[PDB]
Design a protein around this ligand. Structure first.
Ligand SMILES: CCCCCCCC/C=C/CCCCCCCC(=O)OC[C@H](O)CO
Ligand SMILES: CCCCCCCC/C=C/CCCCCCCC(=O)O
Ligand SMILES: CCCCCCCC/C=C\CCCCCCCC(=O)O
Ligand SMILES: CCCCCCCC/C=C\CCCCCCCC(=O)O
Ligand SMILES: CCCCCCCC/C=C\CCCCCCCC(=O)O
Ligand SMILES: CCCCCCCC/C=C\CCCCCCCC(=O)O
Ligand SMILES: CCCCCCCC/C=C\CCCCCCCC(=O)O
Ligand SMILES: CCCCCCCC/C=C\CCCCCCCC(=O)O
Ligand SMILES: CCCCCCCC/C=C\CCCCCCCC(=O)O
Ligand SMILES: CCCCCCCC/C=C\CCCCCCCC(=O)O
Ligand SMILES: CCCCCCCC/C=C\CCCCCCCC(=O)O
Ligand SMILES: CCCCCCCC/C=C\CCCCCCCC(=O)O
Ligand SMILES: CCCCCCCC/C=C\CCCCCCCC(=O)O
Ligand SMILES: CCCCCCCC/C=C\CCCCCCCC(=O)O
Ligand SMILES: CCCCCCCC/C=C\CCCCCCCC(=O)O
Ligand SMILES: CCCCCCCC/C=C\CCCCCCCC(=O)O
Ligand SMILES: CCCCCCCC/C=C\CCCCCCCC(=O)O
Ligand SMILES: CCCCCCCCCCCCCCCCCCCC
Ligand SMILES: CCCCCCCCCCCCCCCCCCCC
Ligand SMILES: CCCCCCCCCCCCCCCCCCCC
Ligand SMILES: CCCCCCCCCCCCCCCCCCCC
Ligand SMILES: CCCCCCCCCCCCCCCCCCCC
Ligand SMILES: CCCCCCCCCCCCCCCCCCCC
Ligand SMILES: CCCCCCCCCCCCCCCCCCCC
Ligand SMILES: CCCCCCCCCCCCCCCCCCCC
Ligand SMILES: CCCCCCCCCCCCCCCCCCCC
Ligand SMILES: CCCCCCCCCCCCCCCCCCCC
Ligand SMILES: CCCCCCCCCCCCCCCCCCCC
Ligand SMILES: CCCCCCCCCCCCCCCCCCCC
Ligand SMILES: CCCCCCCCCCCCCCCCCCCC
Ligand SMILES: CCCCCCCCCCCCCCCCCCCC
Ligand code: NA
Ligand code: NA
Ligand code: NA
Lengths: 222, 224, 221
């Protein structure tokens, strides 16, 4: 079942990527960079999850699904780049703030991988450092990055706020599931965790970019 | 012989790098970025191939030898080659860094699928290989489609140079997956030594030859 | 002792990062990018050294403190980015020159890691390539990068020269200690090398950015 769930996930990622490609051909004032990011996220995630479907992107250590961290260390900084570019839509870019989010996010994913390879107190030290990074990402998202969005007008700021809440609600679920599942407290079964880390990322990747791209495209004049 | 071939390759990479450095000192309207890219490609490749010459950048796996240092080479040198190609198309005009990074992403993916295919067996190997070939097809579609249209937007003379470089690169690059499939990593029709020689000769043309053709052509556009 | 030294180091890195964050809130004409670089360097290094403190970022092979290379491959190109941005302060950026330093530096760290995994002549081939990369970094630092600093006026060039000497003096210590210690000739003891690679980087990361940011901030008035 776990293999078939990952094949299904990879197929959905491919369909999402093809949909964003089709949208990119009639871009409605959204820059090509947003369409590229929206395609790379699911194609990379799809490849990483295909490796799990094929029985390659996991090892016994309990099963470490290490291909999830290979996925996230690329897909999650790109999702924050997408969020930042939405805040900056129609205005000056702040690439310093964008790269601040990239740095926090790459660190967060690495601490999760090291936490997964760790045992005892050590595991929860790494986990806690990753949670601290996520807290700072959310502080930036609802603080300075939101102030940039507000500077780009009512309609853009409304859309940014929707995308920021959508992202934040889904992202807090990842460390929650991690802690409850086999990598942490071992309260939830492996299959439960697998389903959560199939369904969450469908919404976090393809769902996020449908919401984000549709909302930006709606701002288009003629 | 295999060790000596790799030492020889690394020496040729170093000579190429020194030549591009000397050209960079009298740049003839070509931006410093193009000279830097042209030097990083052969120096990185030369270091990776030095690791093979020293007996380090390879291991035994499925009874075959995986020359893993080739993938360490290509995952850096090949996206830089497409960046060089893209910057040629954009010469004298607005840069499209979105298209350039599209090529970088496709290319890094392509090299990673090759490495994973090499570590794989059976149907799994050809799934990864096939995904890398699809990435190369999309790179070539970009090269002869939208990237060529950018070159044409920069005028007849630039577009003539771009088209020459695009054909040169494309002709060499389609050889890599062809050799890979025929050789020990794939169907095992071609012998290890044949594959070693192909993956010594091809990259001399793909790296140093490409940047000689590209930089000479760009420098020729300069009026002194 | 080795574990406690690494915990202490990680704590000093955290305090440095928090100090640079506080400076960033009243930036005195220094761009946000400089404060971001100044924070990433010690936080990344702190995390890498925490892995050693916890007994994770090392293996027996001699002990390879592999977490040092994970640290340096990110922290050292960022330090050269900081140095390059200082030279370019108040003028046009030369990102080609900056990325030239990044490329040489990442290569240098990788040769050190490969040298550490190597034995005999092979070890010293990789080590020598890394030393050549460092010499080119220093030639750039005191040649073309210093000429950019001089183009940005007397006060900036005075500050740049101070931070270039500070960085250069510390950086030449790393390959010297590496060669003398267990990874090289094995003349210096493991504990001596551990202390050198605790003290040097405190000056190379937090000390460097205190000197750099204080000097740039002083140019505001
Ligand atoms: C294991 C994973 C490895 C990851 C692999 C990473 C690849 C590194 C290189 C990428 C392409 C570089 C892009 C080049 C940037 C564009 C240059 C540019 O903008 O040039 C401006 C102009 O030419 C000057 O005046
Ligand atoms: C091993 C960890 C590797 C992490 C690499 C980072 C992954 C890719 C994400 C990078 C951030 C992309 C930022 C794009 C900025 C676009 C700016 C613009 O559109 O003008
Ligand atoms: C990974 C480590 C991240 C540190 C990198 C440096 C930040 C570079 C930001 C570029 C600044 C451009 C100006 C701007 O839009 O803010
Ligand atoms: C691989 C690269 C990993 C990077 C290192 C991880 C730690 C980096 C975190 C730096 C983030 C701190 C910046 C927050 C302040 C920004 C603001 O004030 O808006
Ligand atoms: C400060 C922010 C840190 C928040 C993170 C929470 C860490 C969770 C604690 C881990 C549970 C330990 C359970 C156990 O060890 O048995
Ligand atoms: C070390 C990093 C510490 C601090 C990161 C601070 C993140 C940004 C907070 C700003 C809050 C706001 O302006 O609303
Ligand atoms: C820089 C280019 C990188 C080359 C990779 C070489 C890695 C060699 C590891 C040592 C192997 C061994 O000594 O057995
Ligand atoms: C590991 C595979 C993916 C790694 C690379 C991902 C690249 C995609 C992300 C960023 C695109 C950057 C676009 C820059 C836009 C600037 C404006 C322009 O000139 O078009
Ligand atoms: C491309 C997307 C990322 C891929 C992830 C890596 C897959 C795992 C590779 C190791 C498989 C080796 C094996 O066959 O056991
Ligand atoms: C065999 C290699 C396959 C691809 C060759 C490239 C085809 C390019 C056609 C698209 C060009 C265009 O968009 O006009
Ligand atoms: C011209 C193409 C050269 C390749 C032919 C040699 C094949 C040798 C072999 O089968 O190993
Ligand atoms: C964290 C951020 C960057 C630094 C991390 C590198 C150290 C990783 C070390 C992981 C080894 C764990 C193996 C073990 O538990 O034995
Ligand atoms: C192996 C991994 C290598 C990662 C290297 C990380 C740091 C790389 C480059 C830093 C680039 C900083 C650019 C600063 C722009 C300054 C500005 O415009 O304000
Ligand atoms: C080891 C691998 C390191 C890879 C380094 C890649 C270097 C190549 C490209 C950087 C080009 C930067 C161009 C900036 C142009 C603008 C300017 O000069 O200010
Ligand atoms: C230590 C050895 C190397 C340092 C060499 C510095 C030479 C600087 C050259 C300055 C110039 O090009 O004018
Ligand atoms: C200050 C204290 C001096 C201690 C000795 C200095 C290092 C010598 C090298 C060694 O013996 O390992
Ligand atoms: C441990 C404490 C950190 C040690 C770092 C300090 C190195 C030297 C810094 C001296 C410059 C500070 C004063 C100034 O430049 O204004
Ligand atoms: C002009 C560039 C061509 C891009 C085509 C690919 C974009 C769709 C997403 C990948 C799907 C792969 C299958 C081939 C199409
Ligand atoms: C053993 C093989 C491990 C996976 C190989 C692919 C690595 C993909 C890149 C990971 C870092 C971004
Ligand atoms: C066994 C194959 C390799 C497993 C380890 C891969 C590490 C990937 C980490 C990605 C960064 C978070
Ligand atoms: C033993 C099997 C139990 C499987 C339970 C898995 C529950 C999955 C729910 C995940 C939540 C997804 C969030 C989507 C938001 C829209
Ligand atoms: C799957 C996640 C949500 C998709 C629907 C979003 C619709 C946005 C408005 C058009
Ligand atoms: C390969 C040749 C590279 C030589 C680098 C010279 C140092 C920089 C001088 C400005
Ligand atoms: C081994 C991979 C890294 C190669 C780096 C290339 C360094 C080139 C330095 C060029 C400096 C130009 C000086 C202008 C004056
Ligand atoms: C032996 C494995 C270490 C080398 C990894 C090379 C990965 C290449 C990525 C394309
Ligand atoms: C064991 C025999 C299997 C042979 C499969 C070879 C086909 C690989 C895919 C080719 C894709 C186009 C190049
Ligand atoms: C003018 C239309 C461009 C089509 C290009 C033809 C395909 C190129 C093949 C390259 C492989 C060698
Ligand atoms: C874009 C260029 C791709 C070149 C791939 C090379 C094709 C090799 C020959 C075609 C596939 C033959 C499959 C035969 C399988 C027999 C078992
Ligand atoms: C050790 C470094 C921690 C913080 C240093 C602050 C120095 C302030 C100087 C004024
Ligand atoms: C993100 C980097 C954090 C490193 C500092 C945390 C370790 C402090 C050790 C003292 C107790
Ligand atoms: C046991 C032999 C030790 C040899 C040390 C070789 C390294 C010397 C210093 C580096 C010189 C590189 C060229 C400049
Ligand atoms: Na967006
Ligand atoms: Na070019
Ligand atoms: Na600086």
């Amino acid at each position: 079942m776990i293999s078939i769930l990952h094949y299904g996930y990879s197929f959905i990622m491919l369909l999402g990527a093809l949909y964003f490609y089709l949208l990119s051909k009639d871009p409605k004032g959204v820059p090509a960079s947003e369409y590229l990011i929206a395609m790379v996220i699911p194609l990379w995630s799809g490849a990483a999850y295909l490796s799990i479907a094929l029985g390659q992107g996991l090892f016994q250590y309990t099963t470490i699904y290490y291909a999830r961290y290979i996925d996230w260390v690329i897909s999650t900084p790109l999702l924050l780049a997408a969020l930042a570019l939405t805040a900056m839509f129609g205005g000056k870019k702040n690439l310093t703030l964008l790269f601040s989010l990239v740095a926090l996010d790459v660190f967060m994913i690495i601490t999760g991988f090291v936490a997964d390879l760790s045992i005892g107190t050590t595991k929860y030290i790494w986990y806690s450092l990753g949670v601290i990074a996520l807290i700072i990402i959310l502080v930036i998202t609802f603080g300075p990055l939101r102030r940039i969005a507000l500077s780009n007008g009512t309609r853009l700021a409304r859309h940014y706020t929707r995308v920021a809440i959508y992202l934040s609600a889904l992202w807090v679920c990842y460390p929650t599931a991690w802690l409850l599942g086999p990598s942490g407290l071992g309260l939830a079964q492996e299959l439960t965790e697998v389903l959560v880390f199939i369904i969450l990322p469908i919404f976090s990747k393809v769902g996020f970019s449908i919401v984000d791209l549709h909302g930006l495209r709606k701002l288009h004049q003629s």
